[PDB]
Amino acid sequence: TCPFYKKIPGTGFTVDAFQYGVVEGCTAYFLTHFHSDHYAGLSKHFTFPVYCSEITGNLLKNKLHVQEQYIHPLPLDTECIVNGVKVVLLDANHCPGAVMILFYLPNGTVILHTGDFRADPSMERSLLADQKVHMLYLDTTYCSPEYTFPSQQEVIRFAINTAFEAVTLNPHALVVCGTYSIGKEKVFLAIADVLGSKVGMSQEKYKTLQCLNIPEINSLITTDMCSSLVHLLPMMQINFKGLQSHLKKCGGKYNQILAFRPTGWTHSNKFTRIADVIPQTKGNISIYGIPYSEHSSYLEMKRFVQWLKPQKIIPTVNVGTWKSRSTMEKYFREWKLEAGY
Numbered sequence: 001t002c003p004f005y006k007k008i009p010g011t012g013f014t015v016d017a018f019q020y021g022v023v024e025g026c027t028a029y030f031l032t033h034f035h036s037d038h039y040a041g042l043s044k045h046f047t048f049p050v051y052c053s054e055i056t057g058n059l060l061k062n063k064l065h066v067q068e069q070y071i072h073p074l075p076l077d078t079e080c081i082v083n084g085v086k087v088v089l090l091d092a093n094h095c096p097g098a099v100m101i102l103f104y105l106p107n108g109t110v111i112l113h114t115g116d117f118r119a120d121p122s123m124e125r126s127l128l129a130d131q132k133v134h135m136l137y138l139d140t141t142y143c144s145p146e147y148t149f150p151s152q153q154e155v156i157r158f159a160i161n162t163a164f165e166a167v168t169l170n171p172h173a174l175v176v177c178g179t180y181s182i183g184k185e186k187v188f189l190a191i192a193d194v195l196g197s198k199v200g201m202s203q204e205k206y207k208t209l210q211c212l213n214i215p216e217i218n219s220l221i222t223t224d225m226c227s228s229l230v231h232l233l234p235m236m237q238i239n240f241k242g243l244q245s246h247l248k249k250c251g252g253k254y255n256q257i258l259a260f261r262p263t264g265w266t267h268s269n270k271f272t273r274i275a276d277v278i279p280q281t282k283g284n285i286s287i288y289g290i291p292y293s294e295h296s297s298y299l300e301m302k303r304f305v306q307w308l309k310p311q312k313i314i315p316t317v318n319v320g321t322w323k324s325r326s327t328m329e330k331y332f333r334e335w336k337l338e339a340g341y
């Protein structure tokens with residue numbers, strides 16, 4: 001059964017609710033982004049209307065084989081009418097094609113559902129600037145002050161400088177980057193750009209990337225592993241055994257691997273600056289964990305919410321435990337008292 005925090009009151013609508021069967025009274029299913037915990041349940045046999053971004057709709061059709069007649073792509077930043085209700089899709093600053101959804105209820109209530117997002121001050125000048133929001137369905141992934149991490153720009157600066165130094169010292173070094181979903185494409189694209197290479201990857205991952213409307217993509221990626229010195233592998237293979245095995249397959253072209261694991265937050269963030277990050281090394285293999293986040297830090301979340309001043313907040317992440325729920329409710333009240341709404 002579909003939980004209450006995936007239902008939009010006063011509508012026929014659900015958000016990211018595809019794993020519950022036919023939801024009673026749902027006339028349109030929204031999908032915020034193509035991440036498996038959110039799309040869980042979709043396939044070529046789905047026969048209800050799905051509303052989403054153009055990019056999410058390319059992935060639905062090509063990767064999950066959802067039939068074209070049930071995919072309803074909407075442009076961003078544009079007022080649209082869906083089953084009698086005005087909606088707008090906004091960029092969520094998460095993975096490619098990820099949106100927030102503004103719903104204008106027939107009774108005058110305005111609801112924002114963030115999906116998954118990384119809050120940014122640039123959002124304070126979207127179509128959100130122009131009216132009041134009553135209810136906020138909020139991505140609370142890192143809703144605690146211990147969650148700190150650097151900007152995405154600082155993390156990419158580290159990665160590009162680290163890769164360029166290594167390969168210039170040793171032209172026979174291979175760079176490998178881990179992946180298990182869409183998102184974080186800048187990590188491997190920025191490294192391949194500084195090295196003058198395309199990124200080599202499997203047919204299945206190449207297919208996924210070709211659905212993303214990234215400019216000049218045919219210029220940046222390839223399935224010819226032999227022509228590339230930046231390789232993508234599944235995240236599960238980014239360990240000493242997995243990388244040793246990959247190095248064997250390269251036919252003595254390379255004698256060293258430098259590998260990156262883009263994670264979210266890890267506890268080494270509470271002690272170390274990005275500048276000071278060091279790898280794990282074994283022999284000719286080094287592995288860097290880099291804190292490239294596509295979710296709001298605590299401070300970014302707090303700033304967004306204090307700017308928006310919602311009347312009610314409904315968390316969509318960490319909702320399974322009473323300790324988590326109580327923690328989050330405490331911070332929401334602090335924020336409200338400090339800002340005065």
Ligand code: NI
Pocket residue numbers: 033035094116
């Ligand atoms: Ni996500």
